[PDB]
């Protein structure tokens, strides 16, 4: 069970076409801190739902 002919670069590209990732494009700006974060995630300085997290 070994290859008989060389796979083409076209075949390589068409096989890797499905390897592309996706952008979140869903940045949420906190009401209080006014900074962006992922949906249902805290900000850099521990802020979420206008609540001051320990942020450590």
């Amino acid at each position: 069970a070994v290859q008989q002919n060389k796979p083409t670069r076209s075949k390589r590209g068409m096989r890797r076409s499905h390897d592309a990732l996706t952008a979140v494009t869903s940045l949420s700006v906190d009401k209080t801190s006014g900074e962006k974060h992922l949906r249902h995630h805290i900000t850099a300085d521990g802020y979420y739902r206008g609540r001051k997290v320990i942020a450590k």
């Binding site: 990732l21 952008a23 979140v24 494009t25």
Partner: protein
Amino acid sequence: METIAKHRHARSSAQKVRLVADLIRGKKVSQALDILTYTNKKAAVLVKKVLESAIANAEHNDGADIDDLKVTKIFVDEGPSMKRIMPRAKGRADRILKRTSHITVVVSDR
């Protein structure tokens, strides 16, 4: 004008790096930075650093208007490959090529 910033001999494969590089092609600086920050990839952080260096070069060397910048041309290619020897069964050896990626980002407000 056009400001170019590149990282040479990066500790990543060009094929894998392109997967994240293609995302920030033709997108504004703010959205590209956000996507790179919230993308969990070694290539993502590498391209984030490259784009930050490009933005800094534009701000310092060139005139003004950081906001109006854009990722005009981003491309990643393969570079020198480090050859290493890995033992296998029957006392044989395999030659493994550790790859490096040259990343380049060119921006222009125009």
